[PDB]
Amino acid sequence: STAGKVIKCKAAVLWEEKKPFSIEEVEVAPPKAHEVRIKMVATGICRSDDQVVSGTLVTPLPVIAGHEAAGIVESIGEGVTTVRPGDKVIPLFTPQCGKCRVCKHPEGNFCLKNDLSMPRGTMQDGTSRFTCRGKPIHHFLGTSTFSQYTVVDEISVAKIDAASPLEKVCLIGCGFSTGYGSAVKVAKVTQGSTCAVFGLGGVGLSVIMGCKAAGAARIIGVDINKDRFAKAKEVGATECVNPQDYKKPIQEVLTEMSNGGVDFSFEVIGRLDTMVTALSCCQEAYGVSVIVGVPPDSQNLSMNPMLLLSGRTWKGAIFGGFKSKDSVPKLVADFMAKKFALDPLITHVLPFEKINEGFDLLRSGESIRTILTF
Amino acid sequence: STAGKVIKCKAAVLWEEKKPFSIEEVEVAPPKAHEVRIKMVATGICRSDDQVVSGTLVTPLPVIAGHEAAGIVESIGEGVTTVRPGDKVIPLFTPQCGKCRVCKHPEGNFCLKNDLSMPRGTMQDGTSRFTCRGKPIHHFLGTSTFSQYTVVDEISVAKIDAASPLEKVCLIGCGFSTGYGSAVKVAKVTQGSTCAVFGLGGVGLSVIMGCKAAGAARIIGVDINKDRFAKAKEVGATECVNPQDYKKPIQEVLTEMSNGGVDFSFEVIGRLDTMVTALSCCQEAYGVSVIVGVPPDSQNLSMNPMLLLSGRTWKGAIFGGFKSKDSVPKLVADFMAKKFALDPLITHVLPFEKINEGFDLLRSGESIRTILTF
Ligand SMILES: NC(=O)c1ccc[n+]([C@@H]2O[C@H](COP(=O)([O-])OP(=O)(O)OC[C@H]3O[C@@H](n4cnc5c(N)ncnc54)[C@H](O)[C@@H]3O)[C@@H](O)[C@H]2O)c1
Ligand SMILES: NC(=O)c1ccc[n+]([C@@H]2O[C@H](COP(=O)([O-])OP(=O)(O)OC[C@H]3O[C@@H](n4cnc5c(N)ncnc54)[C@H](O)[C@@H]3O)[C@@H](O)[C@H]2O)c1
Ligand SMILES: OCc1ccc(F)cc1F
Ligand SMILES: OCc1ccc(F)cc1F
Ligand SMILES: [Zn+2]
Ligand SMILES: [Zn+2]
Ligand SMILES: [Zn+2]
Ligand SMILES: [Zn+2]
């Protein structure tokens, strides 16, 4: 008895940059044509959400943030054919319209309907389904998961296994898939190679899982927080180094360790300097470096193009290069088949009402992934 | 008769930056172990040699430049097994030692014995085989082809078909292979794709040849000199554009023409601004951009890493990605079998004695490639 009606529910609203989320009542409009309204079951706290609070990732405010989640369909608008009420689903922060040139390309995944390149913070139709204190609130990446209910366009949701544990597979909505895919699909890590992963938070650990699954012989974790090394080795790092321990630049250390440069490097932090360092540490003639971290808004890096002329390949990707709607159900199935592990990424599980505390664990460095439960 | 003795011959010596070459007598020492002394037959004037004169490409002076050439073995040092006196050969400015990690890698070609990354201007043993006015003269990229005779390490020379027309196949020693391989081996241009090529000199025309060979549907030539357009279309460009004709930046023009960005772009000029423009004009999610041009010494470019994070691939390569000693003889065999044409690249021919006039033709923009005959 909620279908077709406005739902009044709790959501975490970000009214302004550099302020705590405000947990309060919002109104969620019913889904229009080709839209899906979801009751949220679990959502992760991803560094990108903090970057929105920090102002380094720009998107229109006020906003309902959150993009890594899973829930259950409450209702569908007219014309929806891929999910039904009661289905378990994961919102897709990168859509898959299936009709654009990128969707049709065998390698591309950054669908042209995304709200990332030039964020509008609305539904595909340019409007919002959220109201709070009488004011319209923006959506974020077409997902907006920090709410007991959200509405998403059909191209931004995927149906998953009805038996999946939503408090774990929400990670397939961002963190896990991004890291894993950056290794196995974007870099295409090869058996017996040497990999270096800069940044050992939730996404970096997933890159390590991918490098191990691809059969890398050496996976060097790189982080300035040594507290992260233990878990990195658990999931597959063979060695870990802290740049702060050395008197010489880390790229020099890594080139020496790998007898001339690594086969694959990954920047999984979001800093301009580590992107160049990661590039440099890969072997100059055949090395490949993948940018995964989201850089600060509007800032350019500076680099010497001879680093590329010698033969290096540099690339970046969103969401591990996975075509989202095709891939997410498959990843959940693979998870149910024990093909990979999600527990090592989860360090804290908190009620949704503790979202601010969850963000504090992330900022302090205490957590890898905190999952919020509704 | 000359075996084991010093040979006195004419060479084009560059005593100082920004000055004409001095054609005068030099002394060329006999080859030491694993060295090969070559009587030169033809050499091309490549933009890189002019960059040495300009000082934008740094290597120790005074020097005998020249690196795109063919000739006939005059004598071999002790232990040489891959060429013999009388064989036709092409010197390799990127060596192939066959032993280092890069030589052993299936994709790499920038052998660690190269004299390009940290140029010393000598033979592999750290010394010079050239004397002029009683002073030692530096080698260039282990080739030094602007001389009637040169001495090269065995790893920097390839034996070619004894019936090869040396005044045409010298281009396989640089210009043609670099461009053609940049398209077919490095970028891996696909059938039906859209390519954009920045710079329509000798190497850019070779990239067009490779794109056409690979089956590209559209090949867009980009150059500020419209006099280059006719020849570009002759070798396969479908359209040519001069950035100076437009009010908007050329990456916007190319993105418009290609309905969202090109599949493959190539920077074949050597400017920092065009490397970034070329990267930008490839499609944001799956585009590939290859840097072929040689940038000014020690200068960094500035770019926004979001260009990569969306999915673009950026890479560069030396000599078309070709393992040099393995590939050169195969490229010559293919030329002899009419698999590709070299004549369209050659616009002028002069005797070696007119090398300065040859450089004037390149600098004025009149020539594509001038071949010098000894
Ligand atoms: N490309 C995408 O689709 C995508 C998806 C998810 C996340 N991201 C980006 O990935 C990055 C990683 O996200 P996360 O959730 O793992 O973040 P996180 O904060 O959990 O991990 C960051 C890690 O980097 C380390 N670090 C910080 N500064 C460092 C330095 N100078 N040198 C070495 N290590 C350093 C930190 O100690 C921490 O362990 C963020 O920028 C995030 O926005 C991108
Ligand atoms: N990677 C390698 O192994 C390798 C090998 C050979 C040459 N190179 C480099 O390749 C580059 C091209 O060599 P080339 O012999 O073809 O040179 P070239 O001078 O014959 O051609 C350069 C072309 O660029 C055009 N151009 C100049 N400025 C431009 C601008 N702003 N926009 C568009 N077009 C512009 C010129 O008009 C000209 O046609 C040089 O930098 C050279 O050193 C690299
Ligand atoms: O973590 C989700 C995410 C991924 C890429 C990006 F550029 C912004 C963003 F929010
Ligand atoms: O044209 C030969 C050549 C190729 C690449 C480079 F970096 C320098 C150089 F001289
Ligand atoms: Zn699409
Ligand atoms: Zn995320
Ligand atoms: Zn080698
Ligand atoms: Zn050259």
Swiss-Prot record, chains A, B:
Molecular functions (GO terms): all-trans-retinol dehydrogenase (NAD+) activity; zinc ion binding
Chain sites annotated for binding Zn(2+) 1: C46, S48, H67, C174
Cellular component GO terms, alphabetical: cytosol
Cofactor: Zn(2+)
Any one biological process term the GO annotation gives: retinoic acid metabolic process
Top EC class of this enzyme: oxidoreductase
EC number: 1.1.1.1
UniProtKB keywords: Acetylation, Cytoplasm, Metal-binding, NAD, Oxidoreductase, Zinc
Subcellular location(s) per record: Cytoplasm
Family label: Belongs to the zinc-containing alcohol dehydrogenase family. Class-I subfamily.
Protein name, as recorded: Alcohol dehydrogenase E chain
Organism listed in the record: Equus caballus
